[PDB]
Design a protein around this ligand. Sequence first.
Ligand code: SF4
Ligand code: SF4
Ligand code: FES
Ligand SMILES: [K+]
Ligand SMILES: [Zn+2]
Lengths: 696, 64, 112, 115, 124, 89
Amino acid sequence: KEVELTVDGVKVSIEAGSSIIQAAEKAGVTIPRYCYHEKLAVAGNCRMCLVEIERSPKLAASCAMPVQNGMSVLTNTPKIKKAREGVTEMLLENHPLDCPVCDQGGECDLQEQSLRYGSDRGRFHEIVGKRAVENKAIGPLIKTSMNRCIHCTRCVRFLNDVAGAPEFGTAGRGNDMQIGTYVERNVNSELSANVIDLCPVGALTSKPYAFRARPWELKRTETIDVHDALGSNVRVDTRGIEVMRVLPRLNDEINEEWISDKTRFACDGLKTQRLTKPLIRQGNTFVDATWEEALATIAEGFQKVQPKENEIKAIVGSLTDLESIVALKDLVNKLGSENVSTDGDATTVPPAHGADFRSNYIFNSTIDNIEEADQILLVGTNPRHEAAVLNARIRKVWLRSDLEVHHVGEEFDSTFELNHLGSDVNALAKALTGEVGKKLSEASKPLIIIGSGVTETQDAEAVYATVAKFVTSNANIVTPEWNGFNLLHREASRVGALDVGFTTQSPEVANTKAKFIYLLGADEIVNKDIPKDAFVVYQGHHGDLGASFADVILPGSAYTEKTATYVNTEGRVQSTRAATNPPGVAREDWMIIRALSEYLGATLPYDNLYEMRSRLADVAPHLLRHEVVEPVSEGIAKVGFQSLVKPGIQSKGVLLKNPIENFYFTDVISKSSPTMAKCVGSFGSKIEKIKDEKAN
Amino acid sequence: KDFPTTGYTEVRYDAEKRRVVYEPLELTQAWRNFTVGSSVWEQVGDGKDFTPESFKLPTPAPDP
Amino acid sequence: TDLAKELVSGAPKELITERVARIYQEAKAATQSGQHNTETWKIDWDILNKGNRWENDLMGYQSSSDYMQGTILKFDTREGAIRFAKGQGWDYYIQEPKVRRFVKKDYSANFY
Amino acid sequence: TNPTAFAQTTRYVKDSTEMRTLVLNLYRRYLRHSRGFVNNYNLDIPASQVRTKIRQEFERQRFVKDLPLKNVLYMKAQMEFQELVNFWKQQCHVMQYFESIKGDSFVQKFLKGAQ
Amino acid sequence: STKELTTARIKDISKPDENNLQQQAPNRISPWSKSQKPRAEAQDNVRFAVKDLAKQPRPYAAIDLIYKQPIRYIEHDNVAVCDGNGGAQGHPKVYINLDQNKAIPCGYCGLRFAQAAFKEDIES
Amino acid sequence: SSKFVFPKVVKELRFFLSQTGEASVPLRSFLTKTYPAIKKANPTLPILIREAYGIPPSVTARLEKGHEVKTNLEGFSADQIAKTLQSIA
Ligand code: SF4
Ligand code: SF4
Ligand code: FES
Ligand SMILES: [K+]
Ligand SMILES: [Zn+2]
């Protein structure tokens, strides 16, 4: 297949059908470009990538011209460099003199390529003046200065194809062509803000980040995104103590250089409602207290109420790190209590997927392989909200092949076409044995996706039993070279909590009226019972319902202020990196548990991260391999699928309502982010409004 | 290269000891590293060949 | 290489006992499409759990007691970075860069 | 040009045994001048402690195995002596050399910010 | 009060007084940025205990001044050209588009330009 | 089911084994053929099976006051392990 070609004397071996620019980029030759992006459809309009081919008079758009065999490609002829300076002299003909006031200042491709490939002088002193355009208003997240657009259509190609938001396009003709939405309406996509990164010029910039920093000030720290369970790789930029912006970074297995609008514009919640001093409840208000006084009060309060063996309850929040989970799990068992669980809304005491077998509560197919899946079945999942970036991955497959997606649950407005089947367990029951179930078995690598919201229904066990019954009796679904069962998580500390077994499987214990409740970042306990005679401690970084109920509050650090371990939905183990310091006297999250133990007579053996990181090897030896997935062996997986199948289960016929009823308010940082408040007002809880009432 | 530009320690006059003493480094304004915002594109090409034509190995000419 | 070369460098003991260095290759920035800052390997030190940055009361500066905050080293081979880290006896940890997966891109694909 | 007082040539030794004779010889030279160190530097401690702390720093390097490390630690060994004899360091430096000074519990370091 | 003196507003509520030293500026009471420290809190400090607050620097707030200018109105053209009224001693020349029915301020100067045909609606 | 009803001191059982390799085969064979009976008699006992590459087999049992009893199972056969598990009790 491969065609051997030489670019400027460098031999190139690439796949056939590739374009010249990919061949040149592999040989190391740098070909300037504006309109070509390696995740978008090819348009050939910017005319900057022009090269010379030996058997032609006509310059070739190397981003569009497919590769040949034996072809000789030139890139550094004086003829080409004349063309590059001509094109540069055209883009800057109408470009405004905005660089000082332009938020793209130190990181603009029109600057660096013009500096490198253009002339050093301009020949435009015309008296009529430049072209001026009116800025279009497309929401509270994207700040448009359309004077600066170079008409490269990356915004159009991304939003139409990747994002699935067809309201953005080119309206007009020639010198009056105006990228926008023609009529005034806000752009509605959870991935709409990735256009800010694609727009090479200052035409589309961040509105929350407007005018606040220059790119040479910021310090770039590579960490992970924990607003949803995918764990998308991000880049956090800090100017001293503050975190200024969050951007995606390349990881072809998880996020593929995109992050949802929740991930990047929730950075401003880290400066608001923070817990900075330990607070002790006195009367009906809180007062400041030192770590000596606050730790003593918890130690004193614990002995006053004297919770018994299993009357001590530990609740873990969505954002909580894995090191604090094991620190807390060890601490409570050191007091001899197993009433340890999460703040979710699960129904059955042993969660339907359980914690015994990893293969029953992860994304066994791995995200990088969703590309090659033939048929996908959605069970009660709304990826447009639960895992936004994963949804765009499924669309990209469905656009380039004959993938057919089947959905069972509550109907939602989706980016790609669905084949709706029903909205209850019985609807899924006929579908598995019917025409659609036949489709999956005939396919090579079919996919069954179960959402996180399946558990929060009354029929949590029926669906897991039903689907497993189909899986337990097939050969295509589970092969040596394929594991077709997948579970989609949405809270960033589920797989971490389940990998360490921070979940109680005793129904009587889960019903025990616990007296001492230790809230570890749990902020959704409205349904959870908290008796008036319970002494509650909340250790978190944000003031919300979890801290309001507490009697002593111990400040903790956010994911941008500590080194921690997170396991995403597909089982990959990822460790964050510290970008700033926690504010005030706030301490590390697992350090509090160690220090709290010394006051409670349960002194934990750990003394530092490395000692605690040795403990993660004990609970599960795979928790020491960063960015490495340990797939479940095929034989042992089939054991777990069987124990989910249980005769004698009644399908109550409950609608598989999605758990995310507000896309922007899902975690603690999101609820305290001023920018997310604007989005709900402008876009709505489900990103459905097309008009911005809030406009001033 | 591994030695930081601001060094490790600094001196001040201690009243108790009546003498100038060394203390560990502590900057009131931490140094700002603007060097991160360097060029992401290569700025100068491969150069030009200026070897004398008397110091290059001759190309063996093709045969008839 | 094998020698404990740190005993001649005069560096404070805390770089061996109390600090963690990182060997990494800088990632490509989302904003710009250049691919040159991601071809040299670099060493940077982790920040401190307290005293990395704090606001100066008088003028609102960014005070710091970390003397390695503005120290970044450059290399051209991965091995040279690891060898140099080994020579100084640094407690480092390597961050393997992600590799973009090849996908052929064709102009005609917009209709086929 | 002539070298200054108490100077020595810089030669890279190649035998382990040869170095220890130089190392042991140098040790008494530190010990011999100890009273003068107190007198010239007006030290507030008797010369006994000056002899005391000299010995400790020699032992700190006792267990080096590789030879090239041995020389450099000996090359710098001589230099510190030469500066000390010739009154090149100031009184502030020498005082602070000998004026130097159990770790806190986990709660204590946690309480005050730790490191 | 300390309610206006500590929160930024687009326009004030009461008439500013030049003698009031607690105002953010002599011609404006409230601050004009969300992250600008109020002047009342800034001078409530130990270093001002024995100072003379009337002699500390109090430049006139530039936000209040710039809105005292009239709106330039362009005749039979929807594009205004601004250069800081100094040419080589002003800001770079920037072209402003006036299609929208509002006064578009200049990016550098802050002068507001509009169309003449739109003046009546704008002046409402 | 044999002696699969553990005392009330046992509160957690964890099995470590490699996805490949000889030494992990016996523990895999046991867990694949003996788990369904063990769970059927121990509904409230959580039994975690966690797999990592290149590691020898091992089993951890957790007693009261947080004590965890590690039990290496390298070279044990499909029937010797049944004695090892009960030897915890
Ligand atoms: S987009 Fe680039 S060239 Fe245009 S004004 Fe902004 S910084 Fe200058
Ligand atoms: S707005 Fe930006 S991304 Fe869209 S065509 Fe113009 S330059 Fe390209
Ligand atoms: S990069 Fe090929 S024409 Fe734009
Ligand atoms: K941009
Ligand atoms: Zn102007």
